[PDB]
Amino acid sequence: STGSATTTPIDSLDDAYITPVQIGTPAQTLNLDFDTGSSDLWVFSSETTASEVDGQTIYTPSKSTTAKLLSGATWSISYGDGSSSSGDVYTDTVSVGGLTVTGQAVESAKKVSSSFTEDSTIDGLLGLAFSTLNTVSPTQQKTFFDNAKASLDSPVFTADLGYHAPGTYNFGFIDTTAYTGSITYTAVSTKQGFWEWTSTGYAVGSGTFKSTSIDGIADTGTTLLYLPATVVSAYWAQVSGAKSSSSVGGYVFPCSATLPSFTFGVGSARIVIPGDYIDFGPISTGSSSCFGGIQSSAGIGINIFGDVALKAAFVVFNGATTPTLGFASK
Missing domain, CATH: 2.40.70.10 (Acid Proteases)
Incomplete structure (x- = not known):
């Protein structure tokens, strides 16, 4: 079926x-x-x-x-x-x-x-x-x-x-019509009950790719992309006026900004999140401060590849005896 x-x-x-x-x-x-x-x-x-x-x-x-x-x-x-x-x-x-x-x-x-x-x-x-x-x-x-x-x-x-x-x-x-190129599969740990995997790194905008292992979960139930503070700081440093706001509860940026893309690694493959996907709009109605779609996972205890990341890909949740995750561009 x-x-x-x-x-x-x-x-x-x-x-x-x-x-x-x-x-x-x-x-x-x-x-x-x-x-x-x-x-x-x-x-x-x-x-x-x-x-x-x-x-x-x-x-x-x-x-x-x-x-x-x-x-x-x-x-x-x-x-x-x-x-x-x-x-x-x-x-x-x-x-x-x-x-x-x-x-x-x-x-x-x-x-x-x-x-x-x-x-x-x-x-x-x-x-x-x-x-x-x-x-x-x-x-x-x-x-x-x-x-x-x-x-x-x-x-x-x-x-x-x-x-x-x-x-x-x-x-x-x-659905082989729903994505472009090939699907790259990557290992899953079920030890914490999640679809937990390890990304092979990231890039900010047109910047060079940083090879680094980032353990996290593929989570359709979380809105944003939560990553280590080092990664998140490197992203927002490329946006003029962006800052982490304790009062708002995360990184905010001027609503006049054009956001850079964010790339994450899946094995040797790359998924590109367009900058517009990272814009979550005014912090309150009419504000010129906008909320960022990439935020620090510090104090969550896990990195979360939420909707911001997942919506940039076609994602396979493979529940075979040894589960795996597949990502393709689309």
Whole structure:
């Protein structure tokens, strides 16, 4: 089997991407944030504290003939921005882009933090990291991809995120029309539960490439590119007026700037992020200070190749017995 679904930015800055997902019978369609950095499929639901729902579409298990309470199971997750959610668990039929999994754990939110309530465009998350990170207790649950894998034509999914435009998530096949040149594959460590890999270096603009190993994760659920402070300083030093602002919480730059590109290495191959991809606009409405799309990972504890980086590539998440990651230009 295969599946293919369009993913769409939630706003004009590509702050996140939502993908329609069918849950239950008859289908209830929710727009979920596909997150290769976590491993829980959770949804706003009829069980979510009413004051914490503000415009989201909810899953109502009682209206699904295929929903079953997973008795005794609970979940609770925190994310990198300090947001969180928790609840109980149903199993139900879940389909993405025509690909169907029966018995998928659907984690129903009883509580969500303010950041989730305030974002009316995201109805939940669909985690695509390794199932070892799944938070369901006392019986850990598998991701949608893990459950689908055996049925897939090939044990892969691909992320093809757009810049200020829709893109595609494919399951079970590699669309050879969706990228240019060849795909370069690179090793993955699953030791931390992530799609963790080592970039071979970077360049800033038309500058010379610096060969240096940068360990990090391929994370569709993070907006920006988070890299070591040395790398990030070298980038922003090429932008007149750019500075790290403690009050804003990262590098800012004059909105009048033209940003240089940023290149990262994948083996002997190179992915070029255009400068425009690194512009996240005014820090507040009407400001002439703009927020940068490359930020330091210092104090996160891991480097993160988030959407800023991934949307410059066609990315293969290869879930074969020995997992790997593939990157191509597009």
